[PDB]
């Protein structure tokens, strides 16, 4: 597991902080994650919502933000995104004359016709509300 | 083009807390379909003010994607895009100009060549923020 260290730092970090904070209760907690991490998310909330158990930090909503990537040249000076190198990478799968065909019809035949079972809806999952 | 799909999730939002008697709205999960092209910051920027003065306002909104999923009206085979996509992966990966490719892609500095260059962000996993409540004095 890689998802697990990463929920004992975050359920570290933030038990240590309302301790010594004298909370009584820890409400919500942000987290932000670099675009470099390979990490499941739904897995740490596993990981972290089980590890706050029995302790003040119980219900408490927990956000995920990303980080963008973003690196800089110490011999130039050049300073870039993750963005620019993926098109750089992706202009190379370009020439291996790659692709279209693949995406847009049925793996099984050749088809090329088809429906949209999942894709394009927007419902509302849930809602949370207080009450007398 | 969201202007009114905000708006047709706050009358349904709204509406429950109508026919519950709620006293507030904490949270809002709405679920989006990756084929649909909109801005999320927008529909979430709009849907605060459609909420401002209202039971709803400050609810916290969670949005949650929604894979496609295909199915062939002439096989009647039904299909995930991660297994189309993903294939091009496995299939890209494979190549030898690959591992040394993805190294003149990644490992390469576009402005010189380099291959000597520090990260800014990206690694790492860290707690943005924390609320709590206290009772002191
Ligand atoms: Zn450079
Ligand atoms: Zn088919």
Same mark, same amino acid.
């Given at each position: ?10 359920? +570290?970090?933030? !038990? ?13 907690? +942000? ?42 040249? +110490? ?6 995104? !993750? ?8 202009? +190379? ?40």
């Amino acid at each position: 597991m890689h998802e697990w260290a990463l929920a004992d730092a975050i359920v +570290r970090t933030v !038990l240590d902080y309302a301790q010594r904070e004298g909370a009584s209760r820890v409400k919500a907690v +942000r987290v932000v994650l670099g675009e470099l991490q390979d990490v499941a998310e739904d897995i740490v909330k596993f990981a972290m919502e089980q590890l706050f158990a029995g302790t003040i930090a119980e219900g408490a909503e927990i956000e995920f933000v990303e980080e963008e990537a973003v690196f800089k040249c +110490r011999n130039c000076n050049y300073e870039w995104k !993750l963005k620019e190198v993926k098109d750089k990478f992706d202009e +190379r799968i370009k020439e291996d004359i790659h692709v279209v065909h693949a995406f847009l019809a049925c793996p099984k035949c050749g088809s090329h016709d088809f429906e949209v079972v999942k894709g394009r809806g927007v419902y509302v999952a849930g809602i949370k509300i207080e009450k007398e």
